[PDB]
Ligand binder design. Structure first.
Ligand SMILES: *[C@@H](C)/C=N/c1c(NC[C@H](O)[C@H](O)[C@H](O)CO)[nH]c(=O)[nH]c1=O
Lengths: 255, 96
């Protein structure tokens, strides 16, 4: 298998605009949204058909209740942060939890918080400690580190539970997640353009006489095409060639 | 600390005049989440425009994709108009 990952994000907004939710939580398997929750719907809903088809109402019902609680917790935690920062107006609070199952069989686990889109608290599951960016984060770090069992719980969730959910979701979404759609690559006046590929992970470079020189190259972002596939590009007497690497297949376009 | 959106306007498949396609506008790397995106055809806003739900990046920024079904022509000029707290006036990005 290729590298896969499971991530859940939480976004809390203090003082939101008319409409805009105070809380949003979204789950992803790789680049794919799988689940969604907000303070307006107040319901956990699937974001992939293979999630809807494989998890009974019971799952959605249970997690809807947990997310209602997690939403309230996020409100209270943001209130604490904004007060200790002595900030006025609308401010954001975000959380990202997740894990990866690497091609080699090894795993990674991560958990971090951000305030106003900037790193706030970063968990270290090996030392069971929280890395604080400033004194407000340091005050929270001392409070979270005083609950030793929660750090232990979090290590177990990241290392065991998360991986098990990811393997489960990978099987559900196998026809989507484990497929390969090779890129269609073209060169034009110099632009190397690829489209129609899946997974989004691709490497494109230009070689001048079989030597790279990555400084003299402009790389385009891997962009969603809208049909489940991706597109990308890279622009630049000498011989030029475009090199494309995708899912263990190397491609060369000589000019 | 606020981040200005990156705006990318491209077609789903390589464009051919007279052939039905999808015009995409990928808005990313922005913070905070509040954003207004409109797809323009000859300066005028397109009504039938679909979009992805607000999405989350590991760097804490957000992204979305706005798209519409269209048949490109030589005459017709397409653009993406974006507004964010980081922008004084809405930013109009033209399609190549
Ligand atoms: C459906 C399973 C939605 N889950 C969800 C979660 N779930 C992961 C995990 O149990 C949770 O993050 C714990 O806080 C970890 O200690 N998390 C999330 O942020 N959003 C969700 O919708």
């Amino acid at each position: 298998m290729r590298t896969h990952s499971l991530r859940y994000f939480r976004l809390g907004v203090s003082d939101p605009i008319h409409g805009v939710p105070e809380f949003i939580s979204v789950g992803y398997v790789d680049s794919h949204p799988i689940t969604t929750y907000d303070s307006v719907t107040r319901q956990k809903e699937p974001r992939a058909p293979w999630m809807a088809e494989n998890l009974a109402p019971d799952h959605w019902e249970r997690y809807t209740q947990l997310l209602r609680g997690w939403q309230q917790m996020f409100k209270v935690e943001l209130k604490r942060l904004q007060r200790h920062y002595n900030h006025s107006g609308s401010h954001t609070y975000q959380r990202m939890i997740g894990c990866e199952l690497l091609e080699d069989g090894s795993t990674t686990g991560f958990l971090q918080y951000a305030y106003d889109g900037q790193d706030f608290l970063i968990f270290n599951k090996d030392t069971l400690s929280w890395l604080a960016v400033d004194n407000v984060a340091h005050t929270i770090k001392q409070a979270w580190e005083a609950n030793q069992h929660e750090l232990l719980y979090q290590k177990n969730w990241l290392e065991e539970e998360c991986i098990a959910w990811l393997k489960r979701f990978l099987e559900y979404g196998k026809d989507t997640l484990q497929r390969t759609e090779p890129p269609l690559v073209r060169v034009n006046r110099l632009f190397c353009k690829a489209h129609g590929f899946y997974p989004p992970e691709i490497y494109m470079t230009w070689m001048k006489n079989g030597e790279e020189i990555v400084q003299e190259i402009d790389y385009g972002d891997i962009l969603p095409s809208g049909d489940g596939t991706y597109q990308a590009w890279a622009s630049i007497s000498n011989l030029y060639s475009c090199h494309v690497e995708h899912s263990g297949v190397h491609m060369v376009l000589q000019v | 600390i606020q981040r200005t959106p990156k705006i990318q306007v491209y077609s789903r498949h390589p464009a051919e005049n007279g052939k039905s396609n999808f015009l995409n506008c990928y808005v990313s790397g922005f913070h905070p989440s509040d954003i207004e995106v409109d797809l323009l055809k000859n300066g005028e806003r397109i009504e039938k425009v679909e979009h992805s739900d607000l999405s989350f990046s590991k760097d804490w920024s957000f992204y979305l994709l706005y798209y519409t079904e269209f048949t490109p022509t030589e005459k017709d000029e397409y653009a993406c108009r974006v507004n964010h707290v980081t922008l004084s006036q809405p930013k109009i990005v033209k399609w190549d």
